[PDB]
Design a protein around this motif. Structure first.
Motif, PDB file in Angstrom:
ATOM      1  N   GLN A  34       0.836  -1.198   0.000  1.00  0.00           N
ATOM      2  CA  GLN A  34       0.000   0.000   0.000  1.00  0.00           C
ATOM      3  C   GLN A  34       0.875   1.254   0.000  1.00  0.00           C
ATOM      4  O   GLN A  34       1.899   1.297   0.681  1.00  0.00           O
ATOM      5  CB  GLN A  34      -0.926   0.003   1.209  1.00  0.00           C
ATOM      6  N   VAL A  35       0.478   2.266  -0.769  1.00  0.00           N
ATOM      7  CA  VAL A  35       1.191   3.536  -0.762  1.00  0.00           C
ATOM      8  C   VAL A  35       1.455   4.056   0.665  1.00  0.00           C
ATOM      9  O   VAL A  35       2.608   4.009   1.086  1.00  0.00           O
ATOM     10  CB  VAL A  35       0.499   4.571  -1.633  1.00  0.00           C
ATOM     11  N   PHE A  36       0.462   4.525   1.440  1.00  0.00           N
ATOM     12  CA  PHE A  36      -0.964   4.686   1.119  1.00  0.00           C
ATOM     13  C   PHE A  36      -1.663   5.203   2.372  1.00  0.00           C
ATOM     14  O   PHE A  36      -1.008   5.543   3.348  1.00  0.00           O
ATOM     15  CB  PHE A  36      -1.598   3.378   0.708  1.00  0.00           C
ATOM     16  N   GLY A  37      -2.991   5.253   2.344  1.00  0.00           N
ATOM     17  CA  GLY A  37      -3.782   5.516   3.539  1.00  0.00           C
ATOM     18  C   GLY A  37      -3.612   6.860   4.234  1.00  0.00           C
ATOM     19  O   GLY A  37      -2.801   7.692   3.827  1.00  0.00           O
ATOM     20  N   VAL A  38      -4.385   7.061   5.304  1.00  0.00           N
ATOM     21  CA  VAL A  38      -4.394   8.316   6.053  1.00  0.00           C
ATOM     22  C   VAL A  38      -4.838   8.103   7.498  1.00  0.00           C
ATOM     23  O   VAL A  38      -5.829   7.417   7.769  1.00  0.00           O
ATOM     24  CB  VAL A  38      -5.288   9.325   5.374  1.00  0.00           C
ATOM     25  N   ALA A  39      -4.106   8.720   8.421  1.00  0.00           N
ATOM     26  CA  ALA A  39      -4.276   8.467   9.844  1.00  0.00           C
ATOM     27  C   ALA A  39      -4.613   9.730  10.611  1.00  0.00           C
ATOM     28  O   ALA A  39      -3.965  10.759  10.422  1.00  0.00           O
ATOM     29  CB  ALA A  39      -3.014   7.872  10.402  1.00  0.00           C
ATOM     30  N   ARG A  40      -5.598   9.641  11.505  1.00  0.00           N
ATOM     31  CA  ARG A  40      -6.042  10.794  12.288  1.00  0.00           C
ATOM     32  C   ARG A  40      -5.448  10.824  13.691  1.00  0.00           C
ATOM     33  O   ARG A  40      -5.270   9.789  14.331  1.00  0.00           O
ATOM     34  CB  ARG A  40      -7.561  10.841  12.358  1.00  0.00           C
ATOM     35  N   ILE A  41      -5.153  12.027  14.164  1.00  0.00           N
ATOM     36  CA  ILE A  41      -4.551  12.195  15.472  1.00  0.00           C
ATOM     37  C   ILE A  41      -5.622  12.304  16.555  1.00  0.00           C
ATOM     38  O   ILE A  41      -6.238  11.297  16.901  1.00  0.00           O
ATOM     39  CB  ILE A  41      -3.655  13.404  15.481  1.00  0.00           C
ATOM     40  N   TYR A  42      -5.829  13.521  17.073  1.00  0.00           N
ATOM     41  CA  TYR A  42      -6.784  13.827  18.159  1.00  0.00           C
ATOM     42  C   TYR A  42      -6.233  13.579  19.573  1.00  0.00           C
ATOM     43  O   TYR A  42      -5.602  12.563  19.832  1.00  0.00           O
ATOM     44  CB  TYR A  42      -8.104  13.094  17.951  1.00  0.00           C
ATOM     45  N   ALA A  43      -6.474  14.512  20.487  1.00  0.00           N
ATOM     46  CA  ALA A  43      -5.977  14.372  21.858  1.00  0.00           C
ATOM     47  C   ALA A  43      -6.689  15.270  22.887  1.00  0.00           C
ATOM     48  O   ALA A  43      -6.401  16.464  22.971  1.00  0.00           O
ATOM     49  CB  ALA A  43      -4.474  14.606  21.904  1.00  0.00           C
ATOM     50  N   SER A  44      -7.608  14.680  23.661  1.00  0.00           N
ATOM     51  CA  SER A  44      -8.277  15.365  24.768  1.00  0.00           C
ATOM     52  C   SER A  44      -7.191  15.928  25.643  1.00  0.00           C
ATOM     53  O   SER A  44      -6.190  15.260  25.857  1.00  0.00           O
ATOM     54  CB  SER A  44      -9.129  14.388  25.571  1.00  0.00           C
ATOM     55  N   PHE A  45      -7.367  17.148  26.146  1.00  0.00           N
ATOM     56  CA  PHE A  45      -6.389  17.713  27.068  1.00  0.00           C
ATOM     57  C   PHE A  45      -6.186  16.733  28.226  1.00  0.00           C
ATOM     58  O   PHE A  45      -5.575  17.069  29.241  1.00  0.00           O
ATOM     59  CB  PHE A  45      -6.821  19.086  27.563  1.00  0.00           C
ATOM     60  N   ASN A  46      -6.716  15.522  28.049  1.00  0.00           N
ATOM     61  CA  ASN A  46      -6.433  14.395  28.918  1.00  0.00           C
ATOM     62  C   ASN A  46      -6.385  13.096  28.116  1.00  0.00           C
ATOM     63  O   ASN A  46      -7.075  12.144  28.460  1.00  0.00           O
ATOM     64  CB  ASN A  46      -7.471  14.296  30.020  1.00  0.00           C
ATOM     65  N   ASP A  47      -5.581  13.069  27.047  1.00  0.00           N
ATOM     66  CA  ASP A  47      -5.238  11.835  26.311  1.00  0.00           C
ATOM     67  C   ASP A  47      -4.291  12.061  25.120  1.00  0.00           C
ATOM     68  O   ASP A  47      -3.338  12.844  25.196  1.00  0.00           O
ATOM     69  CB  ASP A  47      -6.483  11.099  25.854  1.00  0.00           C
ATOM     70  N   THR A  48      -4.569  11.357  24.024  1.00  0.00           N
ATOM     71  CA  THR A  48      -3.782  11.448  22.795  1.00  0.00           C
ATOM     72  C   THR A  48      -4.006  10.209  21.928  1.00  0.00           C
ATOM     73  O   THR A  48      -3.532   9.120  22.256  1.00  0.00           O
ATOM     74  CB  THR A  48      -2.301  11.619  23.108  1.00  0.00           C
ATOM     75  N   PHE A  49      -4.724  10.377  20.820  1.00  0.00           N
ATOM     76  CA  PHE A  49      -5.094   9.251  19.963  1.00  0.00           C
ATOM     77  C   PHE A  49      -4.053   8.922  18.882  1.00  0.00           C
ATOM     78  O   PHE A  49      -3.120   9.676  18.663  1.00  0.00           O
ATOM     79  CB  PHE A  49      -6.472   9.477  19.342  1.00  0.00           C
ATOM     80  N   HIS A  65      -4.410   6.414  15.214  1.00  0.00           N
ATOM     81  CA  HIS A  65      -5.051   5.388  14.400  1.00  0.00           C
ATOM     82  C   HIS A  65      -5.066   5.758  12.923  1.00  0.00           C
ATOM     83  O   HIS A  65      -5.195   6.927  12.566  1.00  0.00           O
ATOM     84  CB  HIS A  65      -6.472   5.087  14.914  1.00  0.00           C
ATOM     85  N   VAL A  66      -4.960   4.732  12.079  1.00  0.00           N
ATOM     86  CA  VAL A  66      -4.687   4.905  10.658  1.00  0.00           C
ATOM     87  C   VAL A  66      -5.488   3.964   9.760  1.00  0.00           C
ATOM     88  O   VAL A  66      -5.060   2.834   9.495  1.00  0.00           O
ATOM     89  CB  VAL A  66      -3.202   4.726  10.402  1.00  0.00           C
TER      90      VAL A  66
END
Lengths: 128, 174, 215
Positions: A11-26, A28-29
């Motif tokens: 795969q080239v490829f794909g796209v992954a999102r971040i995100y982070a509650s001022f009490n976490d940090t995500f 996933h892709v």
RNA sequence: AUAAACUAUGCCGACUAGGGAUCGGGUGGUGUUUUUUUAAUGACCCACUCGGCACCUUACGAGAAAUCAAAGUCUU
RNA sequence: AUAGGGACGGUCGGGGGCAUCAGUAUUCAAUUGUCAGA
């Protein structure tokens, strides 16, 4: 442990999102025009939600002992979309950040369409 | 390359126009580029090829936001520090009436801004009221308390109860 | 050593690739690529990507495109020609750089919403962004006022919208989109407006495809 | 129909005023720009007027003071 | 009556009704994709 099912990536490829509650940090892709979902590892990592994942100390626990297994099942060079944080609720961004997007960058992948997707709306339901 | 922009009212232009050389300097220490468009009347920040930590752009997004809402530059740049958090609390969409909003806002700041100062001393935050926004800067917990105080004040809940509760909490922590 | 991971069966296995392409006045090129899950009898390869939507910044023309890189154009995969994604017009917009950009606190802000009718059997909604311009060398201060009596404001709306509903009734979506992105209308509005009150930074903030017949 | 029904300040009759602030007309316009083989016009702006806009302000009058161009206001 | 009343026009208006839609966000769902926390 995966292998093939609704397959297969390239795969080239794909796209992954971040995100982070001022009490976490995500972390996933998934993939394109929607898609899902080879990749994740977020907060679920270290310490005792004290410091915690707020400070990127576990955003270092990010990707490396985590998302860098994208190099695993074919994922080669993704695409970011930071959303931290929720709103509203409340903005804006969390700890991680440079730790977030930069992290996954210091490994098998590539920057692409870094778009702060953080979602907010035209006057809605009030907090407290 | 990441990029954030914000619009600023005209009555702020002059100030930004004279202090912008400091802004870029402050931003230059993080290799972040910034532009002050006078035609559109906007401030824009963006990463480069020499940005060590791209995540700092989020802090850079807060800076100009604070600058747009009449937060003084010496106070505003403190956001670039790792510990500092901010929060711009919109207070325009609580009241349909015009001069009732003035009353409730006025009650938020109070006489001689005393109540506002008391709030700043109890939540350990910088607070500034301007137009339809309340710009806050400090610890996350202090910011949550400020947001609760402000939002409740706009919904015709007197801030006296909140000030007294925060006063008791302050006293209990000794 | 003892690794903590090991690749067994990539998930991006059953993945087919495609190319982003939209005629209209945008380059023939295949800017960027998309991705999809193989067919499965019920699932039809190039056929799930029907209502797909791509946001693209102007680099969809090689020339003065890198300059005007703030018009966010939104496109829908309308048809697929084996390994290629064909796209028609769906949406037109702007970004925070520009929007927050032109926003000073001593001028006036105007907005005009419009529902246009194109001979193509297409319905649009176009948002316009207007700002009052000084004319006295005095850099807008607390002392400079560039406000425009609310009567003059709507005076412009009334004029702007009315100009555009006629502009659309006489064009093809291919022409309209081409024109909307071009400084053509910035000049026209500028013409009708200096009559009411000299403006600056005029823009077509956003355009939405309300209902597009598929004759 | 209660009111955390308020500039704690009446007014049928009005000034100490201004300065500025906003919305009318009338000027100049010079500034733009439409019209659109050139404009004029139309718009934008500009000043300038007068309309009245509300505000804001005190070289004035107050009252018993904070404040007030009113509560200024006729041995108090 | 540079009272007051009212003519008329020119307006200008977040004036009002009265619908109309446009919208957001919200939430409902619903498959979502995953998939232990949240």
């Amino acid at each position: 442990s995966n292998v093939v099912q609704a397959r297969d990536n390239s795969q080239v490829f794909g796209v992954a999102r971040i995100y982070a509650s001022f009490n976490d940090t995500f972390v996933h892709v998934t993939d394109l025009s929607g898609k899902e979902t080879i990749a994740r590892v977020t907060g679920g990592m270290k310490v005792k939600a004290d410091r915690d994942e707020s400070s990127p100390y576990a955003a270092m626990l990010a990707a490396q002992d985590v998302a860098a297994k994208c190099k695993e099942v074919g994922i080669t060079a993704v695409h970011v979309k930071i959303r931290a944080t929720g709103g509203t609720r409340t903005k804006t961004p969390g700890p991680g950040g440079q730790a977030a997007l930069r992290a996954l960058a210091r490994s098998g992948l590539r920057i692409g369409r870094i778009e702060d997707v953080t979602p907010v709306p035209s006057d809605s339901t009030r907090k407290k | 390359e990441s990029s954030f922009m914000t619009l600023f009212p005209k009555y702020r232009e002059r100030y930004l126009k004279d202090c912008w050389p400091l802004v870029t300097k402050a931003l230059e220490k993080h290799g972040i580029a910034a532009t002050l468009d006078i035609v559109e009347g906007s401030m824009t920040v963006k990463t480069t090829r020499k940005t060590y930590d791209p995540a700092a752009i989020l802090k850079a997004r807060d800076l100009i936001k604070l600058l747009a809402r009449s937060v003084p530059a010496p106070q505003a740049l403190k956001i670039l520090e790792d510990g500092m958090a901010c929060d711009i609390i919109k207070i325009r969409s609580m009241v349909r009436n015009k001069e009732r909003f003035v009353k409730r806002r006025q009650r938020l700041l109070g006489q001689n801004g005393t109540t506002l100062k008391a709030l700043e001393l109890l939540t350990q935050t910088y607070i500034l009221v301007h137009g339809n926004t309340v710009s806050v800067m400090g610890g996350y917990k202090g910011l949550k308390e400020v947001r609760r105080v402000v939002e409740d004040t706009m919904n015709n809940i007197h801030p006296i109860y909140l000030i007294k509760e925060l006063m008791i909490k302050r006293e209990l922590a000794k | 050593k003892k690794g903590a991971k090991k690749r067994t069966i990539d998930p991006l296995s059953r993945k087919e690739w495609y190319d982003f392409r939209a005629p209209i006045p945008f380059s023939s090129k295949s800017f960027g690529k998309t991705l999809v899950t193989k067919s499965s009898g019920n699932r039809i390869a190039s056929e799930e990507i029907k209502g797909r939507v791509v946001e693209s910044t102007l680099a969809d023309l090689k020339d003065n495109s890198n300059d005007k890189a703030w018009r966010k154009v939104k496109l829908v995969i309308d048809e697929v020609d084996g390994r290629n994604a064909k796209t028609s017009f769906y949406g037109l917009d702007i970004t925070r750089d520009r929007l927050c950009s032109m926003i000073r606190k001593w001028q006036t802000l105007i907005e005009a919403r419009v529902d246009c009718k194109t001979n193509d059997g297409y319905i649009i909604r176009v948002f316009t962004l207007a700002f009052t311009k000084k004319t006295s060398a005095g850099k807008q201060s607390s002392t400079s006022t560039c406000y425009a009596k609310s009567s003059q404001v709507r005076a412009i709306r009334r004029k702007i919208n009315t100009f555009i509903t006629n502009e659309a009734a006489k064009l093809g979506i291919a022409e309209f989109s081409k024109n909307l992105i071009g400084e053509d209308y910035t000049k026209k509005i500028e013409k009708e407006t200096k009559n009411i009150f000299p403006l600056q930074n005029i823009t077509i903030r956003k355009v939405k495809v309300l209902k597009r017949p598929k004759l």
